[PDB]
Design a protein around this ligand. Structure first.
Ligand code: HEM
Ligand SMILES: [Xe]
Ligand SMILES: [Xe]
Ligand SMILES: [Xe]
Ligand SMILES: [Xe]
Ligand SMILES: [Xe]
Ligand SMILES: [Xe]
Length: 148
């Protein structure tokens, strides 16, 4: 694969500082879909504004969890079949949390944004297309958590 290499190279840059980059991803997500904010309920409280999420230790740990799941996806970029069962259960957890399957396209737009801003002229259209293909495959697997 050539596009497997485009993924791996772009990711190594982002992986150097995962919380900084993850923070961009979530900041963008809340700018596109403010209704995701109430779904992060850490002992029964709701954030009022997006900037409130940024002071919460549990929210920042969730960013670290996200970036580790993406890192896994990258590691297994050839064959994502090995992650399939874990992603199905991860999707089910998110369904229980209140996330709708439609919102994972906003998530995908926010990932591409973060990549585009981070890599600048290196975010070529082959790499965008590569990441978009990977994410489409990652979402397919996750979406089994909503039944198929
Ligand atoms: C799109 C909106 C999302 C919302 C509202 C959301 C919300 C949550 C919440 C409430 C939890 C439970 C509390 C916690 O562990 O921090 C959770 C767990 C988790 N999230 Fe997310 N999340 C989303 C997206 C993602 C994405 C894109 C990933 C990874 C690519 C991710 C990875 C995880 C992981 C690994 C856990 C721990 C699950 C377990 O093993 O129990 N989440 N998420
Ligand atoms: Xe944020
Ligand atoms: Xe923010
Ligand atoms: Xe954790
Ligand atoms: Xe990471
Ligand atoms: Xe993601
Ligand atoms: Xe991904």
């Amino acid at each position: 694969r050539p596009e497997s290499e485009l993924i791996r190279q772009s990711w190594r840059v982002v992986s150097r500082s995962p919380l900084e980059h993850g923070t961009v991803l979530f900041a963008r997500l809340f700018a596109l879909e403010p209704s995701l904010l109430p779904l992060f309920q850490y002992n029964g409280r709701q954030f009022s504004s997006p900037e409130d999420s940024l002071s919460s230790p549990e929210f920042l740990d969730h960013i670290r969890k996200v970036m580790l799941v993406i890192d896994a996806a990258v590691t297994n970029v050839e064959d994502l079949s090995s992650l399939e069962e874990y992603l199905t259960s991860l999707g089910r957890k998110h369904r229980a949390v209140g996330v709708r399957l439609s919102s994972f396209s906003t998530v995908g737009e926010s990932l591409l944004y973060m990549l585009e801003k981070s890599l600048g002229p290196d975010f070529t259209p082959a790499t965008r297309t590569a990441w978009s293909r990977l994410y489409g495959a990652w979402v397919q697997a996750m979406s089994r958590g909503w039944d198929g």
